[PDB]
Each structure stands twice: as structure tokens, then as C-alpha cells.
Amino acid sequence: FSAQEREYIRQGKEATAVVDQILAQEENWKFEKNNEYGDTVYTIEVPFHGKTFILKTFLPCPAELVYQEVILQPERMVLWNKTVTACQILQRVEDNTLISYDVSAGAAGGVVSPRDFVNVRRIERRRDRYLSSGIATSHSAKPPTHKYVRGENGPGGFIVLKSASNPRVCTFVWILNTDLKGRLPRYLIHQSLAATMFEFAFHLRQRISELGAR
């Protein structure tokens, strides 16, 4: 591996370690907001990157289906997930480290403009869960441009937890630490992120339903 490939690999492992640490501290998550579907958003304060949002949703399908639809098919997720405007895999390192270009849709109400991102992700399959953990990185094919504000994710990820007791249900967790930059006050950004998390959950639920109807 080149030095650059090794740095991408390390970044994915580091992001995975933080995701694991957050999941191991669930008793310390602070409730923030929920909705009428029981989607629940929490926060946790993490060193350096600070405040991190966590979405937890119970879904009526096997964990493997969510792993396929969210974690293994990020480009296809653009089609059904309106919070995702675009996704392009720029580069793969080994089988489980990927560098992507990602564009997030403007806030449902237009106050927060779309951001684009460059991310490294590490995908791990475990006995009882699937993880896609990642963090901002740089890639020469996608410099910042005037088309978008270039946001920067801290450590976070998508996690699907298998149910030991009922194979027909699973738990979906989105850990989201991000800096959208710009000059809006933080509280407005935080409102927009929570809203985006609920919208994500809505599209994921609809996708699982559509797949279960066929």
C-alpha cells in the first residue's frame, strides 16, 4: 500500500474505534428528540469532535436487509433516500475501506443549504452487527468548490444490530458528528440535523416496506 492508502486504512479503523466506544456508552446517551414513529435521537459529547448525534430506530426486517440496502449499496441509496443527493465511490482500498464523495440535500425548509463531503469508510461484518464507520478525508479528485459548502464529518457511521431473540427485526443506529461550516448558529444546524435524521428514518422505513411487498 502507498502511504496514502495506509492513511485511509488507519482513518477507517480510528472511526470504527470511536463508533465502538460510543455504542459501548449507550447508558450515557442523552435523549434529545423523538417522533411519532418512536425514532429517537440522542447526543453524546466525544473528545475533540464534541457533540455527536445518535439516531436509534427499530425496524421490522432482518439486520442483513438493512446492511445490504444502506451499507453495501450507498450509491443505490441515492434513489430512495431523499436526504442523499449524490454518492460516488472514488476509490477502494482492500475489500472494506472505501473513499466516497457525498452530497447532502438542503434542509427540508431551505434554511441549511446542501453540503458536499469527502469520506473514508470502513465496513465490518461482525457476529451480531454490521458497521460502516467513517470520517472526513481528502481526495484529489474532489477538491472543495463553489458549487457547495464542503462539510466535514467527524467519526460516525451506520450500524445494524441483529436481534438475538427475533430474526425478523433489527436495530438501525446512525451516529452523526459533522461540521457543516458556514455562519448559521449552531442551534439551527442541530435542529436541521435532527430533522434530517428523522427524514432518513422515514425513507428507510418506506424502502423496507417496498422491498417486503414485492
Residue numbers in the entry: 231 to 444
From the paper:
StARD3 has since been recognized as a carotenoid-binding protein in the primate retina, where its biochemical function of binding lutein with specificity appears to be well suited to recruit this photoprotective molecule. The lutein-binding function of StARD3 resides within the C-terminal START domain comprising residues 216–444, hereafter referred to as StARD3LBD. StARD1 mobilizes cholesterol as the first committed step in steroid biogenesis, and homology between StARD3 and StARD1 suggested that StARD3 also binds cholesterol. The most remarkable structural feature characteristic of StARD3 and StARD1 is a large (∼1000 Å3) solvent-filled cavity.
The final structural model includes residues 231–444 of StARD3 (the coordinates for residues 216–230 were omitted because no electron density was observed), 224 water molecules, three molecules of ethylene glycol, one sulfate ion and one molecule of l-(+)-tartaric acid. A striking feature of StARD3LBD is the prominent tunnel-like cavity lined by hydrophobic and polar residues with sufficient volume to accommodate a molecule of cholesterol, as demonstrated by modeling. Electron-density maps did not reveal any larger molecules located inside the cavity. The cavity communicates with bulk solvent through two openings, which we will call portal 1 and portal 2. Portal 1 is wider in diameter compared with portal 2 (4  × 8 Å for portal 1 versus 2 × 4 Å for portal 2; distances are measured between solvent-accessible surfaces). A segment of four residues (Gly336, Ala337, Ala338 and Gly339) was associated with weaker-than-average electron density along two alternative chain paths, suggesting that the Ω1 loop is capable of movement just outside portal 1. The new structure includes additional solvent molecules and alternate conformations for several residues, including Arg351, which is located within the cavity, and residues Gly336–Gly339, which are part of the omega loop found just outside the cavity entrance. Modeling experiments indicate that the biologically relevant ligand must protrude from the cavity entrance because it is not possible to completely fit a 30 Å long molecule of lutein into a cavity that measures only 20 Å.
